[PDB]
Amino acid sequence: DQQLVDQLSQLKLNVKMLDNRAGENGVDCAALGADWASCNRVLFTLSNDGQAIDGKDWVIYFHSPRQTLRVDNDQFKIAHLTGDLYKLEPTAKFSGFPAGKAVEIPVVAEYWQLFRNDFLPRWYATSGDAKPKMLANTDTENLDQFVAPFTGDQWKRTKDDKNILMTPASRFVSNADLQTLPAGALRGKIVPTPMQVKVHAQDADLRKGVALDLSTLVKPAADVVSQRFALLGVPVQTNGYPIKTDIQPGKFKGAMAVSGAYELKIGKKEAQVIGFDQAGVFYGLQSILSLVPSDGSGKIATLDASDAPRFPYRGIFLDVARNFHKKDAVLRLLDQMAAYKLNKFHFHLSDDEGWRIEIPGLPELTEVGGQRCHDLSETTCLLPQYGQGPDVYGGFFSRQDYIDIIKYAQARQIEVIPEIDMPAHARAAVVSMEARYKKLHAAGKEQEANEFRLVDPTDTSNTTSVQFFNRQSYLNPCLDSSQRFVDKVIGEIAQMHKEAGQPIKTWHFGGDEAKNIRLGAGYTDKAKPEPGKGIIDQGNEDKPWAKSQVCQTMIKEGKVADMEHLPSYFGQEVSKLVKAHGIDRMQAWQDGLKDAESSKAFATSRVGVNFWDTLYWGGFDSVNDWANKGYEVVVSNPDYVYMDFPYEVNPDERGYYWGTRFSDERKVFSFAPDNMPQNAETSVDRDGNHFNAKSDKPWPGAYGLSAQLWSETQRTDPQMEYMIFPRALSVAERSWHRAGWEQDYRAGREYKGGETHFVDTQALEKDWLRFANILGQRELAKLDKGGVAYRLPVPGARVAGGKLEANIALPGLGIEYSTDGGKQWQRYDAKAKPAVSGEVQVRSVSPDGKRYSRAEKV
C-alpha cells in the first residue's frame, strides 16, 4: 500500500564499485552468462533511518546500462523488465529493513562500469495500490549524492589497460607542450582555417560599427549576420566600416567552384565578400565575425583570403529520442553550427525510447511515443528508461515547432536531414502503433486498426537488441502495413519541409543494429560451451523476424534469400518510397545496407552511408569498400567523432565509452578522415594501446564528416551542451580544412603506432597549439555570449620549487587555485606564480567569469 511505498521512498541508497574485473578475481562470469566472460561486482546499500520496514508487497525499480547477473544477498532478487529497467524484489527469505540499519546487497553485473556516470539516478518504489515514489536521495543529477568515489585502479577495464588516469599532476604533463601565445601570433586567424590567406600589417577598425551590404542574401539570412555582429559588440550603422557583398559564380573554377566558396578582402577602409553563392557570401561574413576579438578592441587584421570547403557534408548529429532536448537548445546549436560553417544537421527524431515529431493522422506516435511513465500496459506511455523518474517524462516537436526549426536552419545555410530509424531501434513506433491498433479495434474499426500496424501477430521470435529490448524494438519489414506507415511518415515530414521552404534532399533510413546480440561471438551455447564466453541457451535465440509467418512467405516467393538480408531489402524498398516523394538521396548507417550489391540497388541516384566502424578494429580498410561500391561515405567513426564519449580518462567525467576511452578537443582535431591509416601514428586504441593500419585498396575519398551526440546519459540540455562544446569546434575545423600534416592516402603504406614516423607531428602539434589558443583567448568568450554551457577543462598543475605551476588544454582560459579546502579561490598568474604549501585545488573559469570547471586536488 501507500504506507509501504512511503517507507521505501525514505531509504537512502549508496552505490559502491567493488571490482570492475571480477572475472580476473575468482568470479566465473562465463557461468553467469556474461559476454566474453567479463563481469563486475557492485554493492548496493539501502539505509533506513526510520522504523522497521517489514512489508513484502513491494517492487523497487531501477535503471542500469548493464544487466544484473547475480544477487549475493538471498533476501532479494533482481529481474529485468525491458531496456534498462530492472526490478529489485524481496524473496521468501526477506526479513525486513531494520530500524536504523543498512542492508547490503552485492550484485554481479555484465561487463564493467568504469565511469560513475554508468550509475543512473531515480530509483523508485511501488506496492499494490500506491502511486510510485522515488527514493529521495537518488532524485538528482548530482551522482555524489548516491555514488561513492572510485578508488585505486577501479577505472581500469583489464589489468593490462594502458590508458592514463587524468589528475592535475598527470594532466599537467599531457598539457606541457602547450603555451600561451602572444596576441600578435593570432592576428588574422580565421576558424575554420581558410584555404589561402595573406595577412597584412594594417588593421581595420570596427569600433564605430559596420555598414553592411547584405543585398545578396535573403532577409532571414541577412538578419542572422546583423544579429551576430551585434552579439559580438559590433553595431550596425550606415556610417560604419563598409562591408560589401556580391555573388559571382563565374570567378570560381574547378574544385573551388562549389557551394560555400568565397573570396574575402579586408582592407583598412572597407571589406568585400564575393561568394560563389549565398552560402558563400554567408560564410565570408562568418569569417570576418570569427576575427572579431573578445577583448573589446574591435580591431581585425587586413587580409586577402580565398576559401572553399574540403567536403560538401559537414555534419552534426543529434539524438532527441533517448532523452529530449528542447527547441531552444536546438536553435542554440544551429547558431553555433553556422558560426563555424557546419551545414548538415542530422536529426535523430525516433528510437526505442521516444518519438519526437508530430505526425498528422498518427497521434499515438506523440501521445504515447512522446512520453515515458510507469505504465506497465504501455497504453498511455512507453516504460521509463534512463533515470528520469517514474512520472511522465517526455516532449516532442509539434508540426509548427518543426517548421520553425527548418526555417531557422535554412537562414543559416544548414540542411535538415530527418532520421526515422528502422527496422531496428523502432520500439516507440511499434508500441505506439500497438496502442493505436488496440484503441481502434475496441471501437470495431478493424481495417483502420491494422492500417499502420508494425507487428505480425504470429511472430514469436526471441531476439534481444543492443539495449536489451526484445522483439517490439524491431518493426516488421515484411508487412504491407509497415510500408504504409513509412510512406505516410515520409509524406507528412516532406510536407512540413515544403512549407518551411527547404524541401527534403536526404531521407535518413537509419538501419543500425538490426540483429540479435545473443547470437554474437562473445556468447556460447550451454551444450558445447567454448571457454571465455558467456554461457547461455542459444538454441531458443532467433534472428529478428525468424518466427514471423509473413516474413517466411516472403522468403518463399523468392523475394529475399534469408532472414539476415531483410534489413538491406527493406532499405531498397524504402529508397523507392523516398524517390516517389521526390527525394533523390537516401542515407543510412552502413550496417543496414551491408547486404545490398552496391549503390545501384537503390532507387535514389545518391546513397550515403554514415560509416561507424572503429579504426583500430579494421575500419581503416573496410571504409574503402563502401566508397568503391558507389556510396557517399560520411565518416562517423566512434573512436574520434562520437560526442557521447568522455573528454578524458577520469571516473567523474560524463559519457559512454565503448568505442574509445576518451576524445578531447585535441584528439578530434588530430583525426585525419581522408587518410584513415595515418591515425595509427597519432592516436591509441580504447585500451590505450598503439595500433597498426594499412590498406591496399583504392580510395577515391570521403564525401563528408559527421560528429554525433547520442543522448543516453545527456538527460538535460546543459549536459548535451557540455558534451558537444567545445569539441565541435575541432570537428568544424577538420570538416572544412585539410591540414598540411594530413597526408595523401597511399595504398600499401603501413602506419605503425610507436614505430613508423610518416606523419609530420611537429606540424600537427604547431597547428593544434594555435587552434587551442584561438579557443581559449577568443572563441570560448563567444560561446558564453551564445549561452552555451560548454565544458570547461580542469587545469593541469604541479608543485615545484615551492610554487604552484598550472596549465590548461585551451591556453588563454583563466585558472584559479585554493589553498584552504576550496573555500577561498584566487586567480593564478603565471608570471607571478604563487608560493604554495599543503593541499592545493585548481579549477578553470569562463571568460565572462560566471562559470567554473570542476575543482580537483593536486
From Swiss-Prot:
It catalyses: Hydrolysis of terminal non-reducing N-acetyl-D-hexosamine residues in N-acetyl-beta-D-hexosaminides. Residues 839-858 are annotated as: Disordered. InterPro entries: Beta_hexosaminidase_sua/sub, CBM2/CBM3_carb-bd_dom_sf, CBM2_carb-bd_dom_sf, CHB/HEX_N_dom, CHB_C_dom, Glyco_hydro_20_cat, Glycoside_hydrolase_SF, Hex-like_dom2. The active site is at 513 (proton donor). It comes from the Bacteria. Its EC number is 3.2.1.52. It is found in: Periplasm. GO terms for cellular component: membrane; periplasmic space. Pathway: Glycan degradation; chitin degradation. Digests the beta-1,4-glycosidic bonds in N-acetylglucosamine (GlcNAc) oligomers (mainly dimers). Monomer. This is Chitobiase. The lineage of its organism: Bacteria, Pseudomonadati, Pseudomonadota, Gammaproteobacteria, Enterobacterales.
